[PDB]
Design a protein around this nucleic acid. Sequence first.
RNA 1: GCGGCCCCCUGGACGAAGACUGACGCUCAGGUGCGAAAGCGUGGGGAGCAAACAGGAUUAGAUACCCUGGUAGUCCACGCC
RNA 2: CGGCCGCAAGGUUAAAACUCAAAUGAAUUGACGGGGGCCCGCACAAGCGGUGGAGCAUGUGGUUUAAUUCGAUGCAACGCG
RNA 3: CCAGGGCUACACACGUGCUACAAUGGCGCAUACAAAGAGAAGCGACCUCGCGAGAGCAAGCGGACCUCAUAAAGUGCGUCGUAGUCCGGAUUGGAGUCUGCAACUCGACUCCAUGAAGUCGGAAUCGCUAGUAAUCGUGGAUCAGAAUGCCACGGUGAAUAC
RNA 4: GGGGCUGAUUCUGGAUUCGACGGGAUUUGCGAAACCCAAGGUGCAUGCCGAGGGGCGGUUGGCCUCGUAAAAAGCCGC
RNA 5: CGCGGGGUGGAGCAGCCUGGUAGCUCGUCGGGCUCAUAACCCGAAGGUCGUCGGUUCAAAUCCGGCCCCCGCAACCA
RNA 6: GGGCGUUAAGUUGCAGGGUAUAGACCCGAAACCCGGUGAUCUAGCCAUGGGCAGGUUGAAGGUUGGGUAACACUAACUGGAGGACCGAACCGACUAAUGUUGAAAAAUUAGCGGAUGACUUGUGGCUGGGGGUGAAAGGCCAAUCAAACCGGGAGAUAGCUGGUUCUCCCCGAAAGCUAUUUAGGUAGCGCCUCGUGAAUUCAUCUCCGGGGGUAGAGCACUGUUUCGGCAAGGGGGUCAUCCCGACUUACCAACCCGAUGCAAACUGCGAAUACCGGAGAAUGUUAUCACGGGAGACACACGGCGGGUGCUAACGUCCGUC
RNA 7: AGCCAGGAUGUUGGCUUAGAAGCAGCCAUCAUUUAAAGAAAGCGUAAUAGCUCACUGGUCGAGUCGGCCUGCGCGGAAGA
RNA 8: ACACAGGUGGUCAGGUAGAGAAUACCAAGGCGCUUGAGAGAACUCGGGUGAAGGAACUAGGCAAAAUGGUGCCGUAACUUC
RNA 9: GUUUAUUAAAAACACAGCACUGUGCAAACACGAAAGUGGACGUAUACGGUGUGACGCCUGCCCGGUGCCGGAAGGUUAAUUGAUGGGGUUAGCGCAAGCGAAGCUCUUGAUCGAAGCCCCGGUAAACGGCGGCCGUAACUAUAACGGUCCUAAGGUAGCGAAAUUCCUUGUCGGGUAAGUUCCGACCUGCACGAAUGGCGUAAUGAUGGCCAGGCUGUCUCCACCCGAGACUCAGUGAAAUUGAACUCGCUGUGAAGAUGCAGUGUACCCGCGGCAAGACGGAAAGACCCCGUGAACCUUUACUAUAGCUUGACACUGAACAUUGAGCCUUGAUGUGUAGGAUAGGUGGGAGGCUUUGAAGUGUGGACGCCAGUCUGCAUGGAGCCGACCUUGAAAUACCACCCUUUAAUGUUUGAUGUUCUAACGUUGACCCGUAAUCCGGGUUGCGGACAGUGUCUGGUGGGUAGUUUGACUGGGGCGGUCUCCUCCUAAAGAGUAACGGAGGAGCACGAAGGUUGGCUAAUCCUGGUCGGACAUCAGGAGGUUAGUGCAAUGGCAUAAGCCAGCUUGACUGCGAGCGUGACGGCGCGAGCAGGUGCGAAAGCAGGUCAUAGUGAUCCGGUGGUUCUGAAUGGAAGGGCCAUCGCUCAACGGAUAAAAGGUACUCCGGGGAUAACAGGCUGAUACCGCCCAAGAGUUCAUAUCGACGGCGGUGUUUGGCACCUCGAUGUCGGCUCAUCACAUCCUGGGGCUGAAGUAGGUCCCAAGGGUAUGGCUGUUCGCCAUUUAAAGUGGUACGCGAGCUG
RNA 10: UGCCUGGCGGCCGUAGCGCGGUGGUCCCACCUGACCCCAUGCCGAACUCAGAAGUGAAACGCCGUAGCGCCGAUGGUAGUGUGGGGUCUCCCCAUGCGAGAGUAGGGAACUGCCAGGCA
Length: 122
Amino acid sequence: APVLENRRARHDYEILETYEAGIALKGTEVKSLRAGKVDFTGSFARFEDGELYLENLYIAPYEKGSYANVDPRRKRKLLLHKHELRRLLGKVEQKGLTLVPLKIYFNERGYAKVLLGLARGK
RNA sequence: GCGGCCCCCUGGACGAAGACUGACGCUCAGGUGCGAAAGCGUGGGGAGCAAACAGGAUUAGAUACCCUGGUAGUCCACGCC
RNA sequence: CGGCCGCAAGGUUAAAACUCAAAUGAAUUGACGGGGGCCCGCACAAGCGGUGGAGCAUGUGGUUUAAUUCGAUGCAACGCG
RNA sequence: CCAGGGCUACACACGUGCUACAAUGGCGCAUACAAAGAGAAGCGACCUCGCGAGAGCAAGCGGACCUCAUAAAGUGCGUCGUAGUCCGGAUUGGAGUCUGCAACUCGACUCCAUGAAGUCGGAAUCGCUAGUAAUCGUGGAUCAGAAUGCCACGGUGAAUAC
RNA sequence: GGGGCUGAUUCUGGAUUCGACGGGAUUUGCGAAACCCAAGGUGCAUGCCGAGGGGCGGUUGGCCUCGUAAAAAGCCGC
RNA sequence: CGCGGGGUGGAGCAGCCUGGUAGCUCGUCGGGCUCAUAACCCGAAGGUCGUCGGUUCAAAUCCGGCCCCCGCAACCA
RNA sequence: GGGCGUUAAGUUGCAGGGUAUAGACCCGAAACCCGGUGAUCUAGCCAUGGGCAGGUUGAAGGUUGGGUAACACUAACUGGAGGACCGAACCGACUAAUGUUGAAAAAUUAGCGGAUGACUUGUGGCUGGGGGUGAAAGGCCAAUCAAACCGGGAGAUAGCUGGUUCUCCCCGAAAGCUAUUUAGGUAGCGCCUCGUGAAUUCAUCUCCGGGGGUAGAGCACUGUUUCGGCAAGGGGGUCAUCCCGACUUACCAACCCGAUGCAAACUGCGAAUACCGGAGAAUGUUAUCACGGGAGACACACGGCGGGUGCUAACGUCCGUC
RNA sequence: AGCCAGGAUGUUGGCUUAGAAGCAGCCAUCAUUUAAAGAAAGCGUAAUAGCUCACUGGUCGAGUCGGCCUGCGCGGAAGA
RNA sequence: ACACAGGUGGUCAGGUAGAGAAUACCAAGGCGCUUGAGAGAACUCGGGUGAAGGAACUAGGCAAAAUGGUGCCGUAACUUC
RNA sequence: GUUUAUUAAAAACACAGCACUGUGCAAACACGAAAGUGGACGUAUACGGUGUGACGCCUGCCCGGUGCCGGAAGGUUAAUUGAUGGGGUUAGCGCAAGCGAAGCUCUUGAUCGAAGCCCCGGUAAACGGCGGCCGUAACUAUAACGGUCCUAAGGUAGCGAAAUUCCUUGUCGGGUAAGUUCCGACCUGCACGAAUGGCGUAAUGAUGGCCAGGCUGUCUCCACCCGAGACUCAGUGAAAUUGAACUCGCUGUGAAGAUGCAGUGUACCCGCGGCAAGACGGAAAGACCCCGUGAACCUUUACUAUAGCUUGACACUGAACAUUGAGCCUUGAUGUGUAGGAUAGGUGGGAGGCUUUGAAGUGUGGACGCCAGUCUGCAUGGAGCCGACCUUGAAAUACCACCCUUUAAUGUUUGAUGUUCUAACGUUGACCCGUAAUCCGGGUUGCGGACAGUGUCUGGUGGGUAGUUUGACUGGGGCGGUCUCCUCCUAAAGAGUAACGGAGGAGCACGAAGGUUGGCUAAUCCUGGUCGGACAUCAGGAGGUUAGUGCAAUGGCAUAAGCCAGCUUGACUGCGAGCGUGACGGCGCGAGCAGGUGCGAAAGCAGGUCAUAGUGAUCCGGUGGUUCUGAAUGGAAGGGCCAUCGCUCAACGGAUAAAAGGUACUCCGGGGAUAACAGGCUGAUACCGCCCAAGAGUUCAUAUCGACGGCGGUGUUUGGCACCUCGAUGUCGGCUCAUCACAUCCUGGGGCUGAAGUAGGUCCCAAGGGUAUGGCUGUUCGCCAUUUAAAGUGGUACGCGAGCUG
RNA sequence: UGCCUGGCGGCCGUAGCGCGGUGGUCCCACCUGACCCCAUGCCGAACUCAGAAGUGAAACGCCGUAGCGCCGAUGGUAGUGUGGGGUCUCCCCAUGCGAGAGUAGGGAACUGCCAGGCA
């Protein structure tokens, strides 16, 4: 099932805007993704420096016929242009915004992309 | 628990008078009998309604409330519970 | 559990360990209800003129920025300090 | 502490206001009737000058005296003739004016030219029950200057209530 | 022991994971590590020379200073 | 082979005999409605009407002709 | 020019050799089709007769008592039910032993199930072969049945197996290729035989004219493997910035050349053999070629040499050659 | 080759040495006196060890040592 | 196919014991079954008895051995009674 | 209860009960070409079919597939009908090229046309299916839960190591000394599960498994005894078999397991009773296995037909009427693209027809219709309206013509739908006569009634029935793979050359990627310089064909065969000396000759492409051309000739146009040409031993071990091969009875030990003798119990069935 | 006849490459000019036309030189036809044939027709 939304978020925060951002995966992570027993329970995105790294995303190393992978909950970066990135950061702190993982999947050109959005309303 | 009208059979209550029996009364473990609805058995019946079931919706879900359909059952006899 | 009753569903009879510092009855004051009743106020009506469209003045969110200083944010912030 | 800059940014969104979309109007002419308020590092007459904003001179008045001040709607004539118009004035060009050390960023005003959108406004929504609303001017405070804001003042003056 | 599937969702395509952070290349004006020279300022000046210093230590051979023999700087840690 | 019938937004389907509009939705975007949210409610991005040739004042549409799908009946040295 | 023809006598008997059509050299299937004969065994059904010693159990019902307000209830007795119980005849056939050229083509012996039933049995009837009947096993239909028996088509067909008879003499194979619903069959070629005809036709050797890419070798092309280094650059660690120094490091990154070995999809080389051609003598019963009559053969085996395959395993397997 | 002899000095050798004084260990393998004696040959002590060695004297008195090329043989060699 | 241990419906039914048409012995009746004689080995068939043990046999208690009648007493789970 | 007569009596069949379904009676259904008959002298409480199988509790989820039951707007569709078009003939006409009337004829195939199938809905006590992936719960684990795959749905209860469980003797518990079985549990159900029924169940059972008492010759372990044989005598008197025998053991050899061969050992001649190791002993032309273009039954969405059922047309086959669809005929309405006097069809005639044969313009009726407007009879009336008009791409309700739109109506044609009747036809209602008759016939009547039914034609359905097909190679067969073509290696220096040997490719492409004339010349590296890199283009040098060649590989290619331009069609027609290569069918190469061409000044080159793949015989037709033929003659059809088209006939020499399976119910001909057992050969594998000696062993390689590697022995395992046996060599285990080897389990002798003793380890010598009972399982074996000095390893057809067992 | 050079060939590395030196009267080359013939997939480079100021620089030719290429014995070795033999996966003997590589060494081409120039 390549393509899922975030059933943890609807009833917890509320989206304002929604951006799409390619992720810095490794390959095994991609495999685990092409599968589907990973969860956003607790995962959101954060800017450690000036760059945004979605964190707490757990991606079960591999299942069906798994094998040697890497740190299930690893700080994975996010891609987004300088302009498209200097924004959401300044609107985070507005008074209380949060970068929460909305949906995940691979695009036309076969690239796993993540969908984030501002959060409030809990 | 019992509602159309009619007849047949039948239990209790109540009143007016007087007469008769003369305490023959109260209660009652055990015992016996009755005991709604649902349910069961053997059959009958079967329009309405209706568990179940079928399907339509509603909903986040909706094995529900709503809607369309509908079996048992509701009715009869007898016997049970 | 045992007994007894029933074709069954089950009924009847009827405990103990264990556990809790309660359980319960009638009566509390409010607040609140997508509860009910009674009843008020330019809260809805009858009217007259507007805003919402336009250009502009001005404020704010936003966006941008080297900085766009801080504050004020339903009514009761936004020609507000 | 000081200079320069920003708070005035501008794809957009909203709030509150202003000005219109006009003959119950515009424009010229002439003529009518207020209130309230301010003033010395202030109001500043007259006179002259410039189209004008304004400037040169200069009385008066600490002020029922003097200045700010020549209310506007209105009334009378006159024209327009229902058009994106003589409606409407945004915008932009040029040339100027008073403030102030300093008007690029950003002041206000002036004169000449330019003459957007707008032909009365969806869902909706705000006001007001009387001298109110509507609509016309006037003044004050801040303030060197910078009022469509705010705070006042009177003129005209309705509709409507089961 | 043989058969199929699997190494990124576009079946021969053209580097669009737009993406960051990181790396490479080009340009530019500011800092001297962007840079070079010495006019530009000044007179005993110059350089190399040689030698020594804060409760303590280390580094700029350095920051300081002295001149035919002896006194004081900047950063970090305790 | 032949009789049909069919392709039109990112998928869905009307406009197909009538010529004269490129739309009806789902879904994103705003803007409406609330005291706010929901729910209804609107306006837009977006399609060579498959293709090309064509008559008309004008074509998705009537004509053409072919690529292409699907139904059938039939063909296969 | 080319193809086919003209430049060779045919014909009819007779004997023989082949082929064709026929049973076509003889014997042999399992089967297929046609017509009849069979239900005296067996399967089912129909009509009509028969059989079931002896013992058990004791259903429905009924009677009289008891008991009750009356029913309930109960008790004796009576009754005589049943794919009911034990057990002979009868019917079956579960186990074992014997028997197995039997006493017997399914039995004997000891045990075994049923035994008033969907029981069993006599006589007769009816159902017929792709048909019957079947409490279903493909069972039974006359010692049999996934299609009876008998006669016929009939000498079915048999690319299979077997067999094939008197004598002497001459020659003398093949177990290969090509095709094949072919693979143990067959066809054409090759090889045997007979005949006619034709050149020194053919073989061996000698001298002459040839092309080889094999054995071996080599590593230029090319390829692989191993070792060494290049100034430089570079990398790593070490004193820790940094000596932009030194050392060891082993480390590889950018195109470096050198040496050695090997060569199935390779050669900058290259034999022996073998083969093709010319010419020539000798020898050889034409050994050669063409035509024609008769074929057989197309399962090969081992051994040597050169190899693929396998284990340089096999009395393995697949080619070449003797 | 026997035999009779010697087999040492720094040095009990410094040493991550509990004890080493040759020895799994320590490192190097240098260094004194002699005829010549190894910071090491050994079976190997609680350690000093006792006892033989590689290496040197005497004795004896002529041969001795073991690589290469080749012949024939030997072990390696167990089945019903 | 045999002078074949097999198959073949009906009828008759004595005595003693016995429930009996079972079984045993007999009656009436009918039979010794068409090669005999000796021997007294293995082995085979069919039988009898067996110390101690008692399923150790075996695929398996196969085959044997065992129980065996009439009356009265007594008789568990379970049960469709 | 039934059943395999004659190896199976059972858990199979039957059963009462249950359910689904069909059947209205001339019933369905069955035997019958039919008549008839059964069903039944019955009548839905009846009768057939099918599944399930007392009773109890129950019987969940899925309708996509396949059946069946319905519906139906659409799509396609049979006989039939026979519209068009095209052809043959020839009266005539053209002097002639050709045309061609009527007729007759060949073809074409519109329109009509029912079921079917597609389609839509039901349906599971119809035939069936009841799965994957993922995610999710406090630690694990699982997953109540949620996604998903679209394949219709994903297992409810109950049960579960089972008559189902592969691993498996699962694990735990119980029973036993010990239990592969058993019982009770767990759930990890390879692969239970709800009328192909699930789970239970008292009774019953010559039913399967387990336990125990009693019993015992079943056994330790056999003894004695009575009887029938066996043995002797007498009489009678068989059998299968058999090339001939003067018919020994060993070891070897050998068509591979020897009485017969070699070598050798041993043995005087002949009976009798006994035993079964050999005579691959007898019996049956192996039943397994493979082969044959064998047979037969059986199956099915194999092929092809066919009875049955079903659809339509026509025939037997009626009289009256009504309504209505579709043509076709007149007639009369009918046209709101935009400027504009306005709900303009198109062309064409077309400057007056029309009106007193009574006009506008007022007034209604019927009327259509985007209620925009229009037409009309009636009528008042009472005497007119129109034309380029200037605009419109196109001008007149001025009107008239042949017409399309759409429309309406009488009519003609053709369909269908309905109603009323009767005479064919039916009657398996009634009554009458033949006739004392249940048949049949005729008659009368009632009931149906042109239906039903039957013939002919036709579409569908049709394992109910029938005939057949279902390849071959193969290191047996099957499974997989392969089948034609091309390149290379094997291939042994000419050609050719095999394998289920090692590697790759083809089933095309191109009107230029062909022809010619002229011209040009790659890769790779260095150096520089834009992005720009190890390689993008550019310069120079090196290099020198490594590049390139449409594509696999080999051979070629510079004179280029590589690359670019101009002109062009030689990608040409007829032929072809001569040669290659093939059994053949065929295939290839070819100078040159004639015609005509393109390029070139010209010599000259060109009959496709650097070459080698890129293919499909014949038959049967189709299309164009040629009078070659033409069944009396002239034509014509048809045939021939030349060009051409249609096969993944790919199993590629191509059995048919058309074809899959099962057999354990089987059968025949054959084969040891070819598998299973055993033998043989082999020895990779296995087992046994050795060589090296790092290391383990406190120190120390070799007491005991030993890495990495090396050499062997045996014949003994797993295999390879297919030599013997398929006109038969019986397979595992047990029993009984053995016999040999020694690589020795015990006992004996011994060396080393990391050997104190006791007890061990290891090696050497040794084959004399000895070398366990039991639980479980068919087991060999193994595990478990318990003994013993020990419980040896192997060979002997994995010894031993003419000895036993099964 | 000599020396030189251009053309066309034979031969096809003992002929080639490198490196040194060298030649311009003639020849050859570079070279000058280019509207024009003809030309560039751009370019007068090449192709071409008109020429002759310059130069032997490049190219070319000739001479020299053994750094590379090349040629390359003798002897041996390898293999192999026939015969024979072993300890037979591989060899040996007799006989014939006999490499490849390397060694010595060779080697800076040799040659015919025509033309031109100089002596």
